[PDB]
């Protein structure tokens, strides 16, 4: 099933989702089987780009310094913050899109009246921020293997005129209600993806991983034919539907699985990425 879906592919670019695909959890993180797979990928001439809602530093912290040295990979190139930040292979900033100030002012204003600021992670570039009254200040570290967000007073947070991303950490009690209301309030004003476990990710209208990825394709003159992509959740759908050699992990959402060419027989936990990469390697 996989070998058939891969037949005839001349693959030059490997686009890998991070959470739910390459990264499994706080504990397993990225299995050594996957670190090896990328290591060999880079030795065999494949361009690797991770495509995530996370930042580069977020991805580098979850990997660890040792694994980076092991792979010889430092998140360049990469599509980050759901395609609003894109670096090339040598670190040039091909794209850095922040939310429009007016819309962003309307958003902070909503988040205050809806009382959600003290549970929002505020992202700009390679940094993220939370308020003094945030009970989940440890959240990206504890649950995603990142560094601790920087804690600042509430009225200092509202001084900033824009962000690349706002992650609203939601209780599974409130998710539906809060996201639905956020979606209708900022319909055609913001991009709002729902995290695997119920949180909201808010970015600039019109961008997602797929549009981030096009910058890399133009830059390095790589066609659709030559892209392998693999992912799991809502913000992977655009890149799963829009490439041919596209793959969903066994643990993917229903939508991810239907929009992908092919659903892998193996979960992220079981080394889905290493499994798929080795089947790409035996083509050449």
In the complex, the residues that contact its own copies under the rule CB under 8 A are 8, 100, 102, 187-189, 204-206, 211, 214, 224-225, 241-244, 246, 260-261
Question: How many CB atoms sit inside 10 A of residue 253's CB?
Answer: 18
CB of 236 to Ca ion, least distance (A): 6
Q: How far is the CB of 6 from its own copies (least distance, A)?
A: 12
Binding status of residue 233 toward Ca ion by CB under 5 A: yes
- Give the CB-nearest residue to Ca ion: 20
The reply to whether 271 sits near Cl ion by the rule CB under 5 A is: no
Q: Which stretch binds Cl ion (CB under 5 A): 13-21, 24-32, 187-195, 273-281?
A: 13-21
CA dist list (Å): 22 to 50, 123, 194, 273, 281: 9, 22, 19, 6, 18
- Out of Ca ion, its own copies, Cl ion, none, what residue 205 binds, judged by CB under 5 to 8 A for its kind, is its own copies
Among residues 6, 15, 37, 52, the one that binds Cl ion under rule CB under 5 A? 52
Judged on CB neighbours under 10 Å (0-12, 13-18, 19+), 92 is exposed
> Which of 105, 137 has the CB closer to its own copies?
105
Decide the pairing of beta strands 262-263 and 245-248. parallel
In angstroms, rounded to a whole number, what is the distance separating the alpha carbons of residues 227 and 25? 26
Compute the chain's Rg from CA coordinates: 18
Instruction: Supply the DSSP string of 79-123, one letter for each residue.
Output: EETTTTEEE-TT--EEEE----HHHHHHHHHHHHHTT-GGGEEEE
What sign results for the dihedral spanned by CA atoms 244, 79, 61, 179?
Answer: negative
Give me the least distance between CB of 222 and its own copies, in Å please: 12
Choose between 201 and 232: whose C-beta lies nearer to Ca ion: 232
Strand partners, 194: 200
Which of 170, 154, 157, 100 has its CA nearest to residue 123?
157
Q: How far is the CB of 95 from its own copies (least distance, A)?
A: 11
Assess contact for 235 and 195: CB atoms under 8 A.
Answer: no
Residues 119-138 that bind Cl ion (CB under 5 A): none
**The entry of Cl ion, Ca ion, its own copies, none that residue 174 binds, CB within 5 to 8 Å by partner kind:** none
The correct pick among 11, 14, 15, 18 for binding Cl ion (CB under 5 A) is 18
Task: Please check if 232 is assigned to a binding site.
Answer: yes
Could you say which of 11, 16, 19, 199 contacts Ca ion (CB under 5 A)?
A: 19
Give the interface with Ca ion as residue ranges (CB under 5 A). 17, 19-20, 232-233
Give the interface with Cl ion as residue ranges (CB under 5 A). 18-19, 52-53
């Amino acid at each position: 099933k996989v070998e058939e879906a891969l037949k005839g592919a001349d693959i030059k670019l490997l686009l890998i989702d991070f959470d739910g695909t390459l990264f499994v959890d706080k504990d397993i993180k990225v299995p050594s089987e996957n670190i090896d797979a990328i290591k060999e990928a880079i030795e065999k001439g494949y361009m690797v780009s991770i495509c995530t809602g996370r930042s580069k530093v977020g991805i580098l912290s979850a990997f660890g310094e040792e694994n980076l040295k092991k792979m010889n990979f430092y998140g360049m190139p990469g599509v980050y913050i759901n395609g609003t930040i894109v670096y090339d292979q040598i670190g040039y900033t091909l794209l850095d899109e922040t939310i429009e100030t007016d819309v962003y002012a309307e958003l902070i204003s909503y988040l205050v009246e809806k009382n959600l600021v003290n549970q929002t992670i505020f992202h700009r570039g390679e940094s993220n921020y939370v308020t003094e009254d945030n009970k989940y200040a440890d959240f990206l570290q504890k649950m995603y293997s990142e560094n601790r967000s920087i804690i600042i007073r509430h009225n200092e947070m509202l001084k900033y005129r824009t962000m690349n991303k706002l992650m609203i950490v939601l209780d599974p009690s409130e998710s539906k209600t809060v996201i639905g209301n956020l979606k209708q309030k900022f319909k055609n004003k913001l991009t709002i993806f729902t995290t695997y476990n119920g949180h909201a990710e808010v970015t600039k209208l019109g961008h997602d991983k797929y549009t981030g990825i096009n910058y890399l394709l133009k830059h390095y003159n790589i066609s659709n034919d030559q892209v392998l992509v693999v992912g799991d959740a809502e913000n992977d759908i655009a890149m799963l539907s829009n490439f041919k050699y596209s793959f969903a992990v066994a643990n993917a959402t229903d939508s991810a699985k239907s929009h992908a060419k092919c659903v892998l027989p193996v979960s992220h936990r079981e080394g889905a990425v290493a499994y798929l990469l080795k089947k790409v390697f035996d083509l050449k």
